[PDB]
Design a protein around this ligand. Structure first.
Ligand code: CLA
Ligand code: CLA
Ligand code: CLA
Ligand code: CLA
Ligand code: CLA
Ligand code: CLA
Ligand code: CLA
Ligand code: CLA
Ligand SMILES: CC1=C(/C=C/C(C)=C/C=C/C(C)=C/C=C/C=C(C)/C=C/C=C(C)/C=C/C2=C(C)CCCC2(C)C)C(C)(C)CCC1
Ligand SMILES: CC1=C(\C=C/C(C)=C/C=C/C(C)=C/C=C/C=C(C)/C=C/C=C(C)/C=C/C2=C(C)CCCC2(C)C)C(C)(C)CCC1
Ligand SMILES: CC1=C(C/C=C(\C)CCC[C@H](C)CCC[C@H](C)CCCC(C)C)C(=O)c2ccccc2C1=O
Lengths: 141, 730, 80, 64, 163, 106
């Protein structure tokens, strides 16, 4: 984006009684993920882990243990309610990382700033046999 | 923990522990590997398997001599039962030790089934002292090999790569010394020791120098009168231990069996391993090694190219392919060893080589099934290790136009013409059994389609069997083949084959016909599954590049309609089910045809083996009576251990169905639920795993479930085979 | 710790990018196609191995391949 | 014109392809320097369900 | 005779099996009355059984020690010892019928593929065309060798391969 | 029927009759109700074909010709009222009529 939005760790959360699909001991020790978005009204939405919850008008914040749990929610909000979520990654040390709209534009739209990675300039197939690379790793690279 | 692989050590789950064991002895995929270090690590490991063999043999000798009845068995071999090892189970009760002490020994014991008693007794062992002395000998030889695997790994004594890739020297030394000289010495043992021990003379290390094998000595050998050693053979009325009816011969060509011990003449087997030593020493001097004379291997392959071009370039480019590919060399060895292992099974039951083995009915069975089940496992590895060659060690540009590329080019024809034979035998064989099952059921047993195997009966007539009346050359006195070998082998051979109380060329009927064709269904379709996994290992239309992934991977995903079980590992996986089915038919047919012979009622097999209810009624249901009553509510016999094992295999077989039917995704969601409970529990949460728990992988479950499958397939039949035959004693 | 390689036959459909839940794939400009787009795989550390990307590529044979390899906590999809 | 004519049938020569040594109609051809310009359409589906694919000049040849 | 097999006429077990299978019906026939339908049904089965045994004996079949007829497959022994109808002749009776099915299905496949939408012609058949080919296939061996000698039977490397 | 084998299945059941032995308990059902003759079974069969064609006819009528609306289906409280009283209630009362008036004396 213009600039990465820093994390506001104190924002209101949705109205959700709780469930058993929440966070486990891995979260405090290794890492966990949090997602933010801004809603115009009070609505109901399905959580990835558990049941239904009620959003809040204004900013909202959740905490998840997996990136798929977060991106599963973005696909729901972008489609059903047509919003623009953004989620981070929090380590146990307190470090924070801004992941998904890393360029500000979603990945399915091009942008001039991006640089290609893992781009082979050949056709699928048309690559050396494993015997040529028998004693080190990799036939595709 | 895996030091050879850093990729798995970083894995936090339990997949590290499982995959660390399975990839242990796969040296090629290890980290920091080199072609030179590979051969050295193999050469050292192959010393290890020898160390376990010589120790495994030493354990049988000691545990037999210390706890067995070898001294008592020789005096009355027929009636006395052999003893393998004693029993100490404190969870027994008093009725069990009274039942398991059937042997002459004080405590309970296990009756042997291998047949080592008949083997050791034949080669001249008649005491327990001689077995103690031998068990020490192999344990020394075992330790020597362990010292060599360590010694030949050191900085010095470390063979170079050129030393391993010297094929011409390996053939000459191994064909001449390992095969020939060893066969020459074994003849030296049978002559200097065993034949005297049969004829009463006690020969040992004390007196083998003073005692002559022949009265004349070696003066016939130098003079050229080599027929003096075949002058006075042993008579028919000859006891195997005593000198009553003995002779002076050491090399003879009598042919046939010995009358008392329905076994081959020792003087023949002595004469046998001599001639084998001569051909193998002669073949050893063939290839070229550090002298001007000799053949070269590469020059031969390049030459045998047909001019017209039916094979293209021919056998060119193959020498560097075989010599550099270890998987190629391993496929040919297993395919050769796996076939030989079947010969050992087919040629021993018909030609008993040991004394008092034909009478031990339980022992003949296990030796047949043991080798044949091994022959299937080995032979399924040849194709599997042959498929890995196409992925890892195959170079198309080097092997261009040769036979190996021309096979891989038209593989669609091979796999297709194979599928015809499997389908053909499958429809028409089953249709006849089902045609006979029904028409028996409606009370009309004469409408069955019973076809006589004329082509096989034509052979037995051409090999001395006068029952069928074809009157072929060797069943005809006027032919030259009868005239030749009339003085040599035929009087002893014709007497045995025409005797219908031995397993030498048994009578054949229409029931034997259907099974030999049903066996053909197994080999042709089992080969189809393994051939396909090999030729389509490099690529398929569904997966044009399998070679990039590897031999074993789960799948390529649900896309393209589904890609489950495509890899060559999954072809080997499915063939083992057919290997076991095929060997089961082969082995069921051996047991029942022999039981009817031993029970005297051969008509049981001929009339009932034509329809499938006979197999379920007369073979399985009937012979499972004494076994199933091993532990009754009234009491328990000595067969209780077999009935327990008989269920133990019916259970292990079923547990594999879990890993085969139920797949991973059901379980990983379940383990996630137990993880939640372990953390939310008040006191158990204080304990925490070091490695994260996850369900078993996809490929692991196919392996695990196949092990639980095959072990029940084997433990179930072993109990039935031994219990059915032992309880009836015939 | 999986490997994702995209090949020369991409046509800029973006169906691979839309399908991946974990945001491993993104679109980058390129001069080889009509659409003037190409995929990329900058962050394979977050890859999981679902092979939904391969399912969406409409080519004769795939412009995207997931070559499975060494596992990890993120790759095994472990919430714990 | 750079390549084969519109509506012309051609035979494929990619070894990887489901349509190898098979015939298909040329739907279109791009003349902007693209590596794989020739668009081809076949009647038979592949394993996924797609009946079109862009091939190259060298990878296609005349029918039969 | 051949292979140590007796003819079914001279065998004792063959007649033993006849006396057995009839004794079962005679015991079963005692229960019912003479003029009832169960009596007529069993008497017919008795009549068929007596006919099955005499016809198999009249046909020069070979019965073994068990008393059941055996078949011979080599055409040499079959023709030499007059046992050709058993296996050797039905081999040609089948192959005429089996090739009939191939020559018919092969022609329906080729002809429908020369038109538009051949996929619909498989699930929704052209019955007038199928009957036409089905009554034109009496001489399929002629057309096969005609098509082989001509060369329009096989395709020539216009087929998909995999590598 | 008498073709290849297949007549031995018509076992000696008893009663001047031979056929397959059933295990469905219809004979005891037809005796629990008053049924002494075969003529009652014929008429009962012709009734089923008549009622079955009506049921098939209704499926065409109540779909192809005159099909109800979603409102008619959501009238759930009327179903239970009719299906309890009408179907289970009167149906059991009617059977008692057959039991009382016919099956008991027979
Ligand atoms: C009368 C003339 C004559 C004949 C008949 C032959 C015949 C032969 N020559 Mg030969 N040759 C000749 C003159 C002749 N030669 C002369 C004048 C020279 C010059 C010196 C040579 C030099 C020569 C060389 C140098 C070589 C031969 C070889 C061969 C053999 C294989 C050739 C071939 O194309 O494979 C036949 C082609 C095939 C493609 C094989 C088809 C395989 C079938 C279809 C597989 C079926 C399998 C299936 C499982 C079957 C069912 C089995 C089931 C019942 C168990 C063949 C026996 C080769 C040889 O020795 O190999 C044995 C070889 O290397 N020839
Ligand atoms: C009793 C169980 C059983 C049976 C009957 C089969 C049968 C077959 N397997 Mg198989 N298989 C089994 C268990 C079994 N398998 C198990 C447990 C495994 C381990 C996973 C495998 C693994 C396996 C592999 C990996 C392969 C096979 C193959 C084959 C085929 C071999 C060709 C042949 O002889 O066909 C003819 C034999 C038959 C017995 C035909 C069955 C049909 C009969 C005639 C009945 C006809 C139907 C009848 C008219 C009634 C239908 C009415 C109904 C529709 C209402 C055949 C269809 C191979 C194959 O397909 O190659 C061609 C192959 O590659 N199987
Ligand atoms: C001859 C009178 C007739 C005609 C011409 C039609 C025509 C039509 N009906 Mg209609 N229908 C009829 C009678 C008729 N119906 C009757 C009597 C009923 C009450 C059951 C219905 C109920 C009905 C419904 C509920 C629907 C239609 C639909 C349709 C349309 C699609 C037809 C189709 O897919 O064919 C199907 C052709 C068949 C031959 C189906 C045969 C099915 C039989 C009953 C199964 C037999 C069971 C078998 C013997 C058991 C053994 C199997 C074993 C494995 C156990 C079409 C306009 C559908 C529609 O509106 O289109 C979207 C629709 O949803 N009809
Ligand atoms: C001369 C014999 C020989 C030799 C030297 C090798 C050598 C090798 N094989 Mg090979 N193989 C052989 C015979 C041989 N094989 C045979 C006969 C078969 C057919 C069954 C195979 C089938 C085979 C396959 C399918 C594969 C190999 C692989 C390998 C490689 C090592 C894999 C490894 O470390 O696994 C170590 C594995 C283990 C330690 C696990 C084995 C556990 C077994 C299955 C459990 C047995 C049951 C249990 C103990 C019963 C107990 C009874 C209970 C009641 C108490 C290596 C090159 C692998 C390879 O090259 O990968 C690319 C591979 O995938 N082999
Ligand atoms: C691989 C070879 C081999 C095998 C499989 C066995 C197997 C066995 N030995 Mg044995 N043994 C062997 C070699 C072997 N022995 C050798 C070479 C020696 C000489 C030192 C011995 C000396 C020995 C003694 C002294 C005893 C055993 C005993 C046993 C049994 C104990 C149970 C156990 O876990 O083991 C078991 C049947 C014990 C037993 O009670 O056997 C019934 C016991 O007391 N063994
Ligand atoms: C005379 C010299 C000589 C001798 C005796 C040997 C002997 C051997 N070499 Mg060897 N070798 C030699 C020279 C020699 N080598 C030279 C000069 C080189 C360099 C070119 C090598 C390089 C070499 C390598 C690189 C390797 C060997 C290996 C082996 C061993 C093979 C494994 C084994 O036990 O098979 C035993 C086989 C037999 C005893 C005979 C054949 C068996 C068949 C099946 C016949 C069966 C007969 C009969 C039916 C059996 C009945 C049994 C009875 C009890 C019932 C064996 C001990 C391997 C090794 O180190 O293993 C540890 C190995 O990897 N060799
Ligand atoms: C693989 C198929 C096959 C097999 C195994 C046999 C086997 C046999 N045939 Mg035979 N045969 C076959 C196909 C086969 N036939 C066919 C297709 C024909 C043509 C119709 C014949 C025509 C035939 C005749 C005319 C005769 C035999 C005879 C024989 C027997 C003596 C050996 C022999 O053939 O002469 C040696 C062959 C060397 C190549 C033997 C049982 C003879 C017989 O009756 O035996 C007593 C005899 O006279 N066969
Ligand atoms: C008439 C159509 C037809 C023809 C001419 C062939 C021809 C052939 N098939 Mg094939 N096949 C067909 C249909 C046909 N197939 C169908 C429908 C199936 C799916 C069940 C198969 C499945 C199949 C397999 C699995 C295999 C063959 C194989 C073969 C070859 C050897 C013969 C054989 O094993 O027969 C086997 C025949 C069957 C197993 C059953 C065929 C089904 C019926 C009997 C014929 C179809 C008639 C059709 C419906 C009538 C349409 C008439 C029209 C006027 C309406 C041969 C080239 C083998 C091969 O790979 O080649 C070497 C082989 O292994 N076929
Ligand atoms: C896939 C593959 C592989 C594998 C292979 C295999 C495994 C094989 C099989 C095969 C086999 C395993 C074979 C067998 C053979 C055998 C035979 C071929 C034999 C025969 C014999 C004969 C010739 C004989 C004759 C005679 C005599 C001598 C006398 C008597 C009579 C008679 C006639 C019997 C490899 C590794 C190479 C690699 C590549 C791929
Ligand atoms: C077997 C069968 C059948 C036949 C039969 C039937 C099923 C019949 C019907 C039935 C009936 C036949 C019924 C009836 C009923 C009736 C009723 C149900 C009545 C009652 C009444 C009431 C309800 C009451 C009355 C009253 C009173 C008492 C008082 C006042 C007045 C009133 C009115 C209220 C069919 C073929 C179809 C089918 C198959 C099987
Ligand atoms: C039950 C089950 C599991 C879960 C099973 C588990 C976790 C059991 C394995 C762990 C237990 C604790 C080991 C039990 C001990 C064994 C009896 C002995 C093992 C001996 C080895 C150490 C040699 C899977 O992961 C799975 C995966 C794919 C297909 C099917 C299945 C499946 O069926």
């Amino acid at each position: 984006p213009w600039k990465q939005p820093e994390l506001d760790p104190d924002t209101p959360s949705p109205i959700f009684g709780g469930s058993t699909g929440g966070l486990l001991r891995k979260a405090q020790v290794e890492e966990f993920y949090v997602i933010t978005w801004e809603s115009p009204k009070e609505q109901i939405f399905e959580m990835p882990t558990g049941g239904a919850a009620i959003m809040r008008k204004g900013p909202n914040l959740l905490k998840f243990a997996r990136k798929e749990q977060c991106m599963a929610l973005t696909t729901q909000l972008r489609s059903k309610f047509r919003q623009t979520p953004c989620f981070y990654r929090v380590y146990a040390d307190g470090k924070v990382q801004y992941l998904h709209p890393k360029d500000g534009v979603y990945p399915e739209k091009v942008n001039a700033g991006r640089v290609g990675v893992n781009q082979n300039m050949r056709s699928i197939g048309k690559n050396v046999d494993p015997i040529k690379v028998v004693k080190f790793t990799g036939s595709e690279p | 923990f895996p030091k050879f692989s850093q990729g798995l050590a970083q894995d936090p789950s339990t997949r590290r522990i499982w995959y660390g064991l399975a990839t242990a002895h796969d040296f090629e995929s290890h980290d920091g590997m080199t072609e030179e270090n590979l051969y050295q690590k193999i050469f050292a490991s192959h010393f290890g398997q020898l160390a376990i063999i010589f120790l495994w043999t030493s354990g049988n000798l000691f545990h037999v001599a210390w706890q067995g009845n070898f001294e008592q068995w020789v005096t009355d071999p027929i009636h006395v039962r052999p003893i393998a090892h004693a029993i100490w189970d404190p969870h027994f009760g008093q009725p069990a030790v009274e039942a398991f002490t059937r042997g002459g020994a004080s405590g309970p014991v296990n009756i042997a089934t291998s047949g080592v008693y008949q083997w050791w007794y034949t080669i001249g062992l008649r005491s327990n002292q001689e077995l103690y002395v031998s068990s020490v000998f192999l344990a020394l030889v075992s330790a020597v090999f362990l010292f060599a695997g360590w010694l030949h790994l050191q900085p010095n004594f470390q063979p170079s790569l050129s030393w391993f890739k010297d094929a011409e020297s390996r053939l000459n030394h191994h064909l001449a010394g390992l095969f020939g000289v060893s066969s020459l010495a074994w003849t030296g043992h049978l002559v200097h020791v065993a034949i005297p021990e049969s004829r009463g003379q006690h020969v040992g290390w004390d007196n083998f120098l003073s005692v002559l094998p022949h009265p004349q000595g070696l003066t016939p050998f130098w003079s050229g009168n080599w027929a003096a050693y075949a002058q006075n053979p042993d008579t028919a009325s000859h006891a195997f231990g005593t000198a009553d009816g003995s002779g002076t011969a050491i090399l003879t060509f009598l042919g046939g069996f010995h009358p008392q011990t329905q076994s081959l003449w020792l003087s023949d087997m002595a004469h046998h391993h001599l001639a084998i030593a001569v051909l193998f020493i002669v073949a050893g001097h063939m290839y070229r090694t550090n002298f001007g004379i000799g053949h070269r291997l590469e020059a031969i392959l390049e030459a045998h190219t047909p001019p017209a071009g039916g094979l293209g370039a021919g056998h060119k480019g193959l020498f560097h392919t075989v010599n550099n590919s270890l998987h190629f060399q391993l496929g040919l060895a297993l395919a050769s060893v796996g076939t030989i292992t079947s010969l050992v099974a087919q040629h021993m039951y018909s030609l008993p080589p040991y004394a008092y083995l034909a009478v031990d009915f339980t022992t003949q069975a296990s030796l047949y099934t043991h080798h044949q089940y091994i022959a299937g496992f080995i032979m399924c590895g040849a194709f599997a290790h042959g498929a890995i060659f196409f992925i890892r060690d195959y170079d198309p540009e080097q092997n261009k136009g040769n036979v190996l590329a021309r096979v891989l080019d038209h593989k669609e024809a091979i796999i297709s013409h194979l599928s015809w034979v499997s389908l053909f035998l499958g429809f028409h064989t089953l249709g006849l059994y089902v045609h006979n099952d029904v028409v028996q059921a409606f009370g009309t047993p004469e409408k069955q389609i019973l076809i006589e195997p004329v082509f096989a009966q034509w052979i037995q007539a051409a090999q001395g069997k006068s029952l069928y009346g074809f009157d072929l050359l060797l069943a005809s006195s006027s032919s030259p083949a009868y005239s030749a070998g009339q003085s040599l082998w035929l009087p002893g051979w014709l007497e045995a084959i025409n005797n219908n109380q031995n397993s030498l060329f048994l009578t054949i009927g229409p029931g034997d016909f259907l099974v030999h064709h049903a066996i053909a269904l197994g080999l042709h379709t089992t080969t189809l599954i393994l051939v396909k996994g090999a030729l389509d290992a490099r690529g398929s239309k569904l997966m044009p590049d399998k070679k990039d992934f590897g031999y074993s991977f789960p799948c390529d995903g649900p896309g393209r309609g589904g890609t489950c079980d495509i890899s060559a590992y999954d072809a080997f996986y499915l063939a083992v089910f057919w290997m076991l089915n095929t060997i089961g038919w082969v082995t069921f047919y051996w047991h029942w045809k022999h039981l009817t012979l031993w029970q005297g009622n051969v008509s049981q097999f001929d009339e009932s083996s034509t329809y499938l209810m006979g197999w379920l009624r007369d073979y399985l249901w009937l012979n499972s009576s004494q076994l199933i009553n091993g532990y009754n509510p009234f009491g328990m016999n000595s067969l209780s251990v077999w009935a327990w094992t008989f269920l133990f295999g019916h259970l292990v077989y079923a547990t594999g169905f879990m890993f085969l039917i139920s797949w991973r995704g059901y379980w990983q969601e379940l383990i996630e639920t137990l993880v939640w409970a372990h953390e939310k529990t008040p006191l158990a949460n204080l304990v925490y795993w070091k490695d994260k728990p996850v369900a078993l992988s996809i490929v692991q479950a196919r392996l695990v479930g196949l092990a639980h499958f095959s072990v029940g397939y084997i433990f179930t039949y072993a109990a039935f085979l031994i219990a059915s035959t032992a309880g009836r004693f015939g | 710790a999986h490997v994702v390689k995209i090949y020369d036959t991409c046509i800029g459909c973006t169906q691979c990018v839309r399908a991946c839940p974990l945001d491993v794939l993104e679109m980058v400009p390129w001069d080889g196609c009509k659409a003037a787009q190409m995929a990329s795989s900058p962050r394979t550390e977050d890859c999981v191995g679902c092979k939904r990307c391969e399912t969406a590529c409409p080519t004769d044979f795939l412009s995207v391949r997931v070559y499975l390899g060494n596992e990890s906590t993120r790759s095994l999809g472990l919430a714990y | 014109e750079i390549g084969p004519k519109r509506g012309s049938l051609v035979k494929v020569l990619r070894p990887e392809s489901y349509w190898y040594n098979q015939v298909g109609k040329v739907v279109s051809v791009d003349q902007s320097g693209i590596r794989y310009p020739v668009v081809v359409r076949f009647e038979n589906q592949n394993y996924a369900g797609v009946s079109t694919n862009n091939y190259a000049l060298d990878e296609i040849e005349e029918v039969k | 005779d051949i292979a140590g097999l007796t003819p079914c006429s001279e065998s004792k077990a063959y007649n033993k099996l006849e006396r057995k299978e009839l004794k079962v019906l005679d015991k079963r026939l005692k229960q019912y009355e003479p003029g009832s339908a169960p009596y007529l049904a069993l008497q017919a089965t008795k009549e068929r059984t007596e006919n099955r045994f005499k016809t198999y004996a009249k046909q020069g079949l070979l019965c073994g020690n068990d008393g059941l007829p055996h078949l011979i497959s080599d055409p040499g022994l079959a023709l030499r010892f007059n046992h050709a109808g058993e296996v050797f002749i039905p081999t040609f009776g089948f192959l005429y019928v089996a090739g009939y099915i191939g020559h018919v299905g092969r022609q329906y496949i080729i002809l429908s593929k020369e038109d538009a939408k051949p996929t619909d012609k498989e699930i929704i058949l052209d019955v007038p065309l199928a009957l036409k080919l089905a009554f034109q296939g009496w001489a399929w061996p002629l057309a096969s060798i005609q098509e082989l000698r001509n060369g329009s039977l096989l395709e020539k490397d216009e087929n998909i391969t995999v590598s | 029927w008498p073709i290849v084998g297949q007549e031995i299945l018509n076992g000696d059941v008893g009663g001047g009759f031979q056929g397959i032995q059933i295990t469905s308990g219809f004979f005891q059902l037809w005796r629990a109700s008053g049924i002494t003759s075969e003529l009652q079974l014929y008429s009962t069969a012709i009734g089923g074909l008549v009622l079955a064609a009506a049921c098939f006819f209704a499926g065409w009528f109540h779909y192809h010709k005159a099909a109800p609306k979603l409102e008619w289906f959501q009238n759930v409280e009327s179903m239970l009222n009719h299906h309890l009283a009408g179907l289970l209630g009167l149906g059991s009362l009617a059977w008692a009529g057959h039991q009382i008036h016919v099956s008991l004396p027979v």
